[PDB]
Structure formats: C-alpha cells, structure tokens
C-alpha cells in the first residue's frame, strides 16, 4: 500500500537540573522501531520491533552516533533561540523536529518532510518542493537566511529522495509479516441507559492496525456528526488500536441508527446496528 517513515525529536531545557533532555523515536507507519533517550544510563539507539534487530553492529553504531550528535546540536539551537526571542536563561523551553518520507505502492517518493517547532509553535518547515522554506516569524527568518546561504534544502532533498525511501523499502520487506498486514477492527454496538427517555449507543472498533479508521453514526441515513462523541484513537499496547463513537438516542428509536466502519483491513465497509 502506501507507507511512511518518520523520526521525531524533542529536547526540553531544565535550567538548574543539568543539560536539556533529548528523546527521539523512529516510526514506520504506526509501528515504533527505534528509540534513544539521553537520560538512559547508557544512551544508545535501541530496537523496538523484531525486524530491525537483524541489522548489524555497524547499523547501531551509526544511528547512535547520529543521535548523540543531534542531542548536542539541539542544545546549541536552544541557546540560539533564547537570543532570537530575547528570552532569559531561567525558563524551560522545547525544540521539536520531525522529518521523513511517504511512498506509494510502487515505493516511489510521494512526499518528504522536515519541520521544527519551538515552545509548541511552528518555527520553520521545508516546503513540499524540498527546495524552499516557510518561516513562521522573524526569528525563523534568521534561520532561513542561514540555511539558504548554506544550501541546506538541497542536502535534505537528497536524503529524502534517496536514503529515506530506500531504507523504508528495506524495512517494509524485512518486516513484511507485520508492516504489510492490516488487522481489521473487531466491531460491536453496546447500549447504555441514561434515563427513561434516552440511552447511549456506543459503536466499538477494537484490535485494529493501522490506526487510520472511520467510525460514524447515521440516523435515517443522515450523518450525526455534531451529535456524535468520537474519542481519539488509542493504543491497546499490543500494536493495535481502539476507537469508539457514541450517540444519545431516544427510547424506541434505536433501529433508526446505523454505525459505519471503514478500515483498510476490511474488503467492504461495515454497517452495524444495536442487536438486543
């Protein structure tokens, strides 16, 4: 199908309590495969999926080296950002960076990404052209100027079109047993009396991978968007995910309501109703 690889990084400064903590995780689709935490007793890139374990010592050495260096660079950047925003050295601040690539069924690049946030706000992002920059404010424009001067975008593009897609394809092949298997949702509807006058119908989706899914309630074939409580998709802890959607329904009206489920693990979309 279509697939992604993403690396996430967060550094959080903590003045008075040592250097900023650096945590990074790597993902293919919704499967974590690597991690690194600077507060670990012996910090190193660590495996988190079975198919990445077969990579040799040279792999783990290279990735660990990169992580260790990125930790130091983030710390310099955090100091830079205090200057750009005229901020004091007493407060805690946050630098986030995501990059990675999307590929289609034939494994060709669909889209690359490389973007930063500071204190929870967009700072600078590589545009979809992988050649120009979007800076959120005048501080970020100083970064943009430096990155244009040094032709940084060209370097990122080369990684994003080359190594990002080539290694993602490698990982997809090596983990084909899990990464290229969609687990369909186990679905049912429950009924939860509120009063004499109404009850809740809750449509469940359980045990599904990947996380992307559509759950909706209709009444007389009309979407109940504004009256549906839809919880955030949540991890079960066994690689799969869970979600539910609930509507408040007048007594005796239950059979007017249908729940609709779309997941890539399902050949056709599902229609469910309350079955007493």
């Amino acid at each position: 199908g279509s697939h992604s690889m993403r690396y996430f990084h967060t550094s959080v400064s903590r003045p008075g309590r040592g250097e900023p903590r650096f945590i990074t995780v790597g993902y293919v689709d919704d499967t974590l495969f690597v991690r690194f935490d600077s507060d670990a007793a012996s910090p190193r890139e660590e495996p988190r999926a079975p198919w990445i374990e077969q990579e040799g010592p040279e792999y783990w050495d290279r990735e660990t080296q990169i992580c260790k260096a990125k930790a130091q660079t983030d710390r310099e950047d955090l100091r830079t950002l205090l200057r750009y925003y005229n901020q004091s050295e007493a407060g805690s601040h946050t630098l986030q960076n995501m990059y990675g690539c999307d590929v289609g069924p034939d494994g060709r690049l669909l889209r690359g990404y490389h973007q930063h946030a500071y204190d929870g706000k967009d700072y600078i992002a590589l545009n979809e052209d992988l050649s120009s920059w979007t800076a959120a404010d005048t501080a970020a424009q100083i970064t943009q100027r430096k990155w244009e001067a040094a032709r940084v975008a060209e370097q990122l593009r080369a990684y994003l079109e080359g190594e990002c897609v080539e290694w993602l394809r490698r990982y997809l092949e090596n983990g084909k047993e899990t990464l290229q298997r969609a687990d369909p949702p186990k679905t049912h509807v429950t009924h939860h009396p509120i009063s004499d006058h109404e009850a809740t119908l809750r449509c469940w989706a359980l045990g599904f991978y990947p996380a992307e899914i559509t759950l909706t309630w209709q009444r007389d074939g009309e979407d109940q968007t504004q009256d549906t409580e839809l919880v955030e998709t949540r991890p079960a802890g066994d690689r799969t995910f869970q979600k539910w959607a609930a509507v408040v329904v007048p007594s005796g009206e239950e059979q007017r309501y249908t729940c609709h489920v779309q997941h890539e693990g399902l050949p056709k979309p599902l229609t469910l109703r309350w079955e007493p």
Partner: peptide
C-alpha cells in the same frame, strides 16, 4: 535510517 546532517538554527 537517520539523516546524518545537523543544520544549526
């Protein structure tokens, strides 16, 4: 496999 480039803000 990670980006080996570190571009300073």
């Amino acid at each position: 496999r990670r980006l080996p480039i570190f571009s300073r803000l």
